[PDB]
């Protein structure tokens, strides 16, 4: 940020980009290091009422597998063919 | 739609089961079980014999086309008769969807190499026998990949110790690198974590 | 009873192999000293070979015969190929390891293991 | 339609009669197919899925609308996947997977938990 | 407070002390035994008796959240005095 | 969607040619390059003048651990053992008994520093914030010994740098 | 890039060098960059999202030759894509916890801990036992910077 | 010939009569939440942790006490009776104190156990709690009877096992306080069992105190040699010392006690 | 096609695993028992397989403790006892059974707490 006008024109040509704009050091324009204190949001679960554990509880709704076939009609696929992707219209061709 | 449970996908649910009775209705030569969980992915368990006419169906079919074996790996549960579970993990890119295969084996009894089926298989069957000790037949290069050179024993089996029973040294004496009988400075300190209390119910075991 | 076959159908298959891998062994060792620049002699290394064939003498699975002999292929390979290093090599004669008696007084004197 | 240059994936060489190609495999798959069992769900499932790719080859004569259609990726793969399947059904063959389960597994083999 | 041994060693807070004729003090030669010299069951009985009103009592070791556990102290009996088992600190009933 | 990185047809108008002829004669394209880390030569270099100056942490930083007090010089630690239970590295040695007072209290509280990951856990088990992770990076030694740390290192960690470790705990603890 | 891209020397140590099918990739394992600069149009976080990544925009960057230059182009392009997919984070973050509001799982906030007994039970037993996993075995894939990283879970 | 039928979750199960719904779900593998319930001590039936739905009925039962009836079907995973679980853990839960750190039971409580497995993860509790004083019962077994949840398991152990009734509870209501009332020293043979089937850390062994986690101690199977009735008992140690002794049951011998001696 | 092999499994010589810690190791086969400080069983399921303790001693530097076992730590689960002692066999240790301990089945009556004329009459309650 300290270089002269000569130089930043200097540096400007040879690159040929604004390198001014977009300095790769860091001064001011970042957050403070001092911070004010923060008050966190609570989750769904902190209420007082209409709360049992055991509607909320995923770890207990968790079940075997299902035995399809155990040695103990039209074809299929796992699932259905995958659509074939669009092209960019953000920039196509890099 | 409760914000702490993991929503369930019924649609996934049966469009994978539709597809695992139909490989069981195809091979019913080699498939011994088919199962889907409740977070949708879908296991055939077979008998070894199948693993190249298994994995082969499952690469070239039309309606399969698992063209990437995403890992090979191997389960070692000392209470089985066949200690040593085999796992194929398998992806179609086609149908955007993903399948395991398992088979079992024993200590003295050897694995088809499914190299010929996917050449991923060759590294990951080295893995498997160096860390497991199960032996694949017709393998193109089969020798140790992960331990060290002269390295006895199969570290992942669960009855090899965690620190194993050789430890290395440099000895002034002899000038090089020496191996010699483990002793630590501190013993590894065994947690009994297990609560005493039954968790999951829905998985009890009948007595 | 009836179980897949590593390799040999029976033992007597089983040992041809086993002697083949001996064989293999035997010759290789000249090199080994030589490559490696042990300085241990022919006669020891090749003693080595025959105390580590003699330990397994008592096996009657060809199964267990089979997997010996694919490890000894293995364990022939690497030192061939310079893969294993004179560390590796040496590690087969325990030169830093005090001699631990082997009778009841001396182990009583010493400690508690049996 | 006017030809392509490329597929887009690379190696796979941009085919000149797709068309004709895909009837020569798809004909060809349902020839090694008459030599497998009626009963064989192999051959009930492929020849169905067979005969519903080989109406869309001979009802579009456009190569991207025939694409759109089989929904296969390019025309390029959708051959390549036709071979792969006759690939498959000579080897089924040899492997006759429509007989009865080999052998059932041991007692616990697949519970888990243990 | 830190003793010295007859042998010279500084004594822990934990009562550690090399005995006279142990090796393991030759550790120390040409350097320093680490000993911290606050120790903690000096600083806490310095502390004033806090005379309160109630019969229960609570405390969370003060700094609300930077503290301890909070825990309730039964002063019922006269003879002595609350003490709280996080932090040591001591509690009484004023008559 | 999806873009083409390598697809591109370059034209060939006898301009756009002597354009590209140009550019492999005269090598255009490679003094073009030239010019960047010329321009680099004359921009301010990134280096802090370490030690004089140094680098920007922050007040949640992981550095050597310390035994913490309460203000009346009283140790936090009560032998609860939730630290040396988490402890990823089994970095953490503990022994405990009753005081002479009563008081529940280590008689051991060791940390092998070439064991510890300096993951922060142990700080997180802590119910009463005895053990923490400080901001001191700078404690290199000499010897492999010197960094098993014993319960009088760790707590003399804890006076040396308190002053320190109770700002930063003031300034994150409302994120925790 | 304008030290690379164009740079003749930079194209004559990568162009046409270490090949690879489309095939052969699929059928040796590879996975992310190693498939997309062969063409193959596959990217985890497209075919098969986890987290949040159906709702943001991004490209797939896709590679024609198949070598080490059409790589070094995908893998520059994707840091491009990163810096967009980033611009979409910061502007759609909302509000809200941060870890399940499930106390047998994620560990109660330190303040709850030091004043509820339930808070205090759950955090004494999730640092020292942990929570229990339902009986199971997953493969979990994502798409990592290198590539499709899993773990096949028991 | 006299067995009965009834259901665990469907399940059909032959029982005596007389069994109760507690003993008929353990049949079937269903360990049923418990408090003051012990097997070798007099039902009680006050700690309420053991209720369960009876298919059809309106009102939960205490599984411990009920004897089941022909035809019943218990649901042991009903939301009746998974809300009664978590209802009863909370009640159990609003006086507890935030001892865990301090408490020598933290690790092996069956109050942490049953709160994390039956209970709910969180408080709605917004007040002051209760506060106990603490009693002297002799060198072996230390107090800290703000922990205790008024399970009368020690009480009744001391009077129908020990044989001294000397244990008891003094008062009513929240201020109801097991003890002895008087200054008196519980000292049987048998004493130091109270530690055991406490479920709290409200009776702990004072040779023992703070010196362990239960998590870190490795359990050596081993037998007493204190006397010649042989009980069977864990040696509980720790990097290569005995930390302590506990008892190990066996039906034929020493049951699950051991002496004061042995102990 | 399958061979017939004609004797016991062992294993001993392809396990890696020195001549010292298979011949002179003897393997515990259990069920743990039940911890006495709690009521839960779920702990008291499946077999285990231990063995024998060897040495600790204290480390000079620090004291803590020291071991020259690599089977210090080794503990192996089981669904049956014929398991367990299956696995022994192949790898070669002498081991011990400990037969399963189930808690006999009792007779319990809240009724019996008031009774007319038995000594079952508590005194409190
Ligand atoms: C043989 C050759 C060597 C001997 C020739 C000696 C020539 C005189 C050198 C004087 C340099 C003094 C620098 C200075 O003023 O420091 C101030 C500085 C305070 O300034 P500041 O607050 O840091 O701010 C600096 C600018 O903001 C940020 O700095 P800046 O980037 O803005 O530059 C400021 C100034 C600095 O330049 C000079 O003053 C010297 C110019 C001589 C050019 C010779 C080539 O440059 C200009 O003003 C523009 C004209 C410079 C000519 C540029 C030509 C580039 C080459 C063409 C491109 C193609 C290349 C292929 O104080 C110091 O740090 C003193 C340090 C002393 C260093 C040694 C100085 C002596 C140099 C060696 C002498 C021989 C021994
Ligand atoms: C009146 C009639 C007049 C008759 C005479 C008229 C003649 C005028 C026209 C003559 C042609 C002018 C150019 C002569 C220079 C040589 C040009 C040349 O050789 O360039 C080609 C060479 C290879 O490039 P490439 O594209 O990879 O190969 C062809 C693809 N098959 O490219 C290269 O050499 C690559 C070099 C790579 C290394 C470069 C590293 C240094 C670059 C910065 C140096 C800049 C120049 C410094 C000059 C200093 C002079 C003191
Ligand atoms: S930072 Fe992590 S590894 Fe280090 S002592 Fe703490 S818990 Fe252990
Ligand atoms: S440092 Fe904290 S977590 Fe560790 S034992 Fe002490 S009080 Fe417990
Ligand atoms: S008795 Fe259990 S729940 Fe209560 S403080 Fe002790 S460990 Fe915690
Ligand atoms: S002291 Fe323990 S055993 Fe006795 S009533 Fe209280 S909680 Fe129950
Ligand atoms: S266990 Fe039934 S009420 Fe206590
Ligand atoms: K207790
Ligand atoms: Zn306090």
């Given at each position: ?25 860091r001064?001011q324009?970042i957050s403070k290091r001092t911070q004010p204190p923060p008050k966190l949001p609570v989750g ?51 | ?161 965690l620190s194993?029973?050789?430890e290395?040294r ?12 483990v002793e630590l400075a501190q013993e590894f300190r065994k947690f009994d974590l297990?609560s ?12 | ?114 | ?114 | 407070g830190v003793r010295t041994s007859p042998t010279g060693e500084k004594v822990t807070h934990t009562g550690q002390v090399y005995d006279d004729?142990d090796y393991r003090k030759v550790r120390f030669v040409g350097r320093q035994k680490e000993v911290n010299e606050n120790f903690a069951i000096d600083l806490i009985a310095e502390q004033p008796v806090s005379?309160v009103?109630?019969?229960?009592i609570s405390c969370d070791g003060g700094g609300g959240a930077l503290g301890h556990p909070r825990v309730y102290i ?7 005095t609350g003490t709280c088992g996080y932090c040591g600190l001591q509690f009484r009933?004023?008559? | ?45 990134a280096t802090i003048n370490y030690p004089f100056e140094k680098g920007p942490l922050s007040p949640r930083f992981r550095g050597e651990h310390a035994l913490r007090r309460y203000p009346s010089g009283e140790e936090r630690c009560i032998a609860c053992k939730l630290c040396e239970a988490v402890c990823p590295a089994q970095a953490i040695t503990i022994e405990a008994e009753p005081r002479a007072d009563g008081s529940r209290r280590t008689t051991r509280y060791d940390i092998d520093m070439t064991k510890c990951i300096y993951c922060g856990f142990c700080q997180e088990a802590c119910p009463v914030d005895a053990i923490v992770e400080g901001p001191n990076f700078e404690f290199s030694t000499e010897t492999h010994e010197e960094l098993l740390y014993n319960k009088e290192k760790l707590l003399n960690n804890g006076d040396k740098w308190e002053a320190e470790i109770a700002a930063n705990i003031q300034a994150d603890y409302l994120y925790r | ?96 916890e941060i870890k399940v509001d499930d106390a047998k799982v994620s560990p109660p906030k330190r303040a709850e801990m030091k004043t509820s007994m339930e808070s205090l039970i759950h955090h004494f037993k999730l640092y020292t036992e942990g929570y ?23 | ?92 839960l609003?006086?507890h104190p935030l001892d865990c750190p301090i408490c020598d039971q933290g690790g092996e409580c069956?109050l942490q156990d049953?709160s994390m497995?039956?209970?709910?993860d969180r408080s ?5 709690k209760?506060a ?10 230390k107090?800290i009877?703000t922990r ?53 850390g409200?009776?702990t062994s004072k040779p023992y105190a703070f010196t362990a986690r239960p998590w870190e101690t490795r ?17 509980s140690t720790r990097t290569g010392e005995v930390m302590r ?19 | ?55 600790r001693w204290e480390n000079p530097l620090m004291g803590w403790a020291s071991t020259?076992?690599?089977?210090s730590n ?52």
């Amino acid at each position: 940020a300290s270089a002269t006008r000569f130089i930043q024109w200097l540096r400007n040509w040879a690159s040929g980009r604004d390198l001014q704009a977009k300095l790769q050091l860091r001064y001011q324009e970042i957050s403070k290091r001092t911070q004010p204190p923060p008050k966190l949001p609570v989750g769904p679960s902190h209420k007082l009422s209409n709360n049992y554990y055991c509607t909320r509880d995923g770890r207990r709704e968790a079940m075997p597998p299902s035995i399809v076939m155990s040695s103990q009609k039209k074809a299929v696929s796992p699932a259905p063919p995958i659509k074939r992707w669009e092209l960019s219209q953000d920039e196509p061709y890099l | 739609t409760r914000p702490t449970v993991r929503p369930r996908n019924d649609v996934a649910h049966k469009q994978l089961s539709a597809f695992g009775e139909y490989v069981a209705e195809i091979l019913p030569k080699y498939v011994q079980q088919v199962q889907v969980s409740c977070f949708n992915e879908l296991e055939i368990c077979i008998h070894p014999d199948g693993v190249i006419p298994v994995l082969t169906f499952l690469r070239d079919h039309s309606n399969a086309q698992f063209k990437s074996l995403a890992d090979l790996t191997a389960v070692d549960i000392p209470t089985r008769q066949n200690r040593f579970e085999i796992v194929y993990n398998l992806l179609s890119l086609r149908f955007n969807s993903r399948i395991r295969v398992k088979t079992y084996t024993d200590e003295l009894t050897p694995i088809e190499s499914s190299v010929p089926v996917y050449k991923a298989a060759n590294w990951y069957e080295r893995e498997i026998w160096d860390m497991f000790g199960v032996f694949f037949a017709n393998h193109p290069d089969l020798r140790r990949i992960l331990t060290d050179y002269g390295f006895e024993g199969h570290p992942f089996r669960k009855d090899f110790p965690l620190s194993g029973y050789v430890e290395l040294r440099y000895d002034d004496e002899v000038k090089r690198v020496v191996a010699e009988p483990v002793e630590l400075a501190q013993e590894f300190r065994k947690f009994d974590l297990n609560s005493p209390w039954e968790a999951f119910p829905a998985y009890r075991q009948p007595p | 009873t009836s179980v897949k076959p590593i390799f040999s159908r029976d033992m007597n298959e089983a040992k041809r192999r086993v002697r083949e891998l001996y064989r293999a062994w035997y010759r290789e060792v000249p090199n080994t000293v030589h490559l490696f620049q042990l300085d241990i002699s022919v006669k020891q290394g090749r003693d080595k070979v025959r105390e580590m064939f003699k330990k397994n003498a008592h096996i009657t699975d060809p199964r267990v015969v089979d997997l010996l002999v694919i490890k000894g292929k293995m364990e022939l390979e690497e030192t061939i190929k310079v893969w294993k290093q004179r560390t590796h090599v040496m590690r087969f004669f325990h030169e830093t390891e005090a001699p631990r008696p082997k009778d009841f007084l001396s182990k009583f004197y010493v400690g508690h293991d049996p | 339609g006017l030809l392509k240059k490329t597929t887009g994936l690379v190696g796979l060489a941009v085919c000149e009669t797709p068309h004709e190609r895909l009837k020569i495999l798809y004909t060809k798959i349902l020839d090694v197919l008459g030599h497998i069992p009626k009963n064989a769900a192999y051959r009930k499932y492929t020849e169905q899925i067979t005969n519903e790719k080989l109406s869309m080859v001979k009802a579009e004569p456009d190569v991207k609308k025939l694409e759109e259609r089989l929904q296969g990726g390019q025309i390029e793969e959708v051959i390549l996947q036709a071979e792969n399947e006759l690939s498959l059904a000579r080897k089924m063959i040899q492997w006759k997977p429509w007989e009865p389960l080999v052998e059932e597994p041991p007692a616990s083999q697949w519970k888990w938990p243990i | 407070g830190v003793r010295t041994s007859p042998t010279g060693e500084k004594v822990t807070h934990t009562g550690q002390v090399y005995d006279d004729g142990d090796y393991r003090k030759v550790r120390f030669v040409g350097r320093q035994k680490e000993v911290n010299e606050n120790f903690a069951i000096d600083l806490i009985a310095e502390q004033p008796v806090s005379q309160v009103g109630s019969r229960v009592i609570s405390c969370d070791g003060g700094g609300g959240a930077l503290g301890h556990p909070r825990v309730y102290i039964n002063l019922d009996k006269e003879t002595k005095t609350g003490t709280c088992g996080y932090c040591g600190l001591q509690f009484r009933q004023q008559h | 969607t999806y873009k083409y990185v390598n697809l591109r047809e370059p034209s060939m108008d006898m301009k756009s040619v002597t354009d590209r002829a140009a550019q492999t004669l005269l090598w255009t394209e490679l003094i073009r390059g030239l010019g960047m880390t010329l321009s680099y030569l004359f921009r301010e270099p990134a280096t802090i003048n370490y030690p004089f100056e140094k680098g920007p942490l922050s007040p949640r930083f992981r550095g050597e651990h310390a035994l913490r007090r309460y203000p009346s010089g009283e140790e936090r630690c009560i032998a609860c053992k939730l630290c040396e239970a988490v402890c990823p590295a089994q970095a953490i040695t503990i022994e405990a008994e009753p005081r002479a007072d009563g008081s529940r209290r280590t008689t051991r509280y060791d940390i092998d520093m070439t064991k510890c990951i300096y993951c922060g856990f142990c700080q997180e088990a802590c119910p009463v914030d005895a053990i923490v992770e400080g901001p001191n990076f700078e404690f290199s030694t000499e010897t492999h010994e010197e960094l098993l740390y014993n319960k009088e290192k760790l707590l003399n960690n804890g006076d040396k740098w308190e002053a320190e470790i109770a700002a930063n705990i003031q300034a994150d603890y409302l994120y925790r | 890039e304008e030290m690379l891209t164009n740079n003749r020397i930079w194209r004559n140590r990568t162009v046409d060098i270490g090949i690879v099918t489309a095939e052969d990739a699929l059928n040796y394992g590879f996975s992310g960059v190693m498939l997309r600069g062969s063409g193959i149009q596959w990217d985890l976080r497209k075919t098969q999202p986890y987290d949040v990544y159906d709702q943001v925009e991004f490209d797939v960057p896709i590679g024609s030759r198949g070598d080490c230059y059409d790589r070094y182009l995908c893998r520059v392009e994707e840091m491009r894509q990163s810096i967009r997919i980033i611009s979409q984070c910061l502007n759609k973050m909302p509000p809200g916890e941060i870890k399940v509001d499930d106390a047998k799982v994620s560990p109660p906030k330190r303040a709850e801990m030091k004043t509820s007994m339930e808070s205090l039970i759950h955090h004494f037993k999730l640092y020292t036992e942990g929570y229990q996993v339902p009986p199971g075995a997953t493969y979990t894939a994502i798409e990592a910077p290198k590539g499709e990283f899993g773990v096949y879970l028991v | 010939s006299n067995l009965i039928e009834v259901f665990v979750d469907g399940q059909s199960v032959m029982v005596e009569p007389g069994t109760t719904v507690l003993q008929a779900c353990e049949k079937v593998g269903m360990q049923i939440p418990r408090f003051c319930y012990h097997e070798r001590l007099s039902v009680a039936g006050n700690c309420r942790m053991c209720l369960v739905e009876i298919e059809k009925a309106p009102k939960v039962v205490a599984a411990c006490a009920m004897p089941v009836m022909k035809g019943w079907n218990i649901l042991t995973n009903s939301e009746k009776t998974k809300k009664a679980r978590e209802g009863v853990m909370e009640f159990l839960l609003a006086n507890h104190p935030l001892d865990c750190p301090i408490c020598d039971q933290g690790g092996e409580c069956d109050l942490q156990d049953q709160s994390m497995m039956f209970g709910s993860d969180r408080s709605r509790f917004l007040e002051g709690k209760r506060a106990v004083e603490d009693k002297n019962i002799g060198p072996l077994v230390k107090t800290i009877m703000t922990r205790c949840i008024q399970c009368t398991r020690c009480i009744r152990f001391a009077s129908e096992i020990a044989g001294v009734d000397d244990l008891g509870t003094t008062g009513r209501g929240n201020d109801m306080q097991v003890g002895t009332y008087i200054e008196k020293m519980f000292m049987s043979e048998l004493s130091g069992n109270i530690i055991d089937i406490c479920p709290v850390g409200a009776l702990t062994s004072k040779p023992y105190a703070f010196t362990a986690r239960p998590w870190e101690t490795r359990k050596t199977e081993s037998i007493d040699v204190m006397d010649a009735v042989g009980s069977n008992i864990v040696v509980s140690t720790r990097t290569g010392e005995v930390m302590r002794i506990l008892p190990r049951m066996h039906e034929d011998i020493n049951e699950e006690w051991i002496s004061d001696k042995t102990r | 096609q399958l061979i017939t092999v004609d004797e016991k499994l062992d294993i001993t010589t392809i396990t890696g695993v020195p001549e010292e810690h298979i011949k002179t190791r003897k393997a515990r086969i259990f069920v743990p028992a039940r911890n006495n400080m709690q009521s839960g069983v779920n702990n008291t399921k499946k077999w285990k397989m231990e063995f024998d303790t060897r040495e600790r001693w204290e480390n000079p530097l620090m004291g803590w403790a020291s071991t020259a076992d690599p089977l210090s730590n080794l503990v192996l689960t089981f669904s049956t006892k014929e398991d367990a002692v299956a696995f022994a066999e192949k790898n070669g240790w002498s081991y011990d059974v400990e037969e399963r301990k189930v808690p006999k089945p009792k007779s319990k009556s809240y009724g019996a707490n008031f009774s007319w004329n038995k000594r079952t009459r508590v005194s409190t309650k």
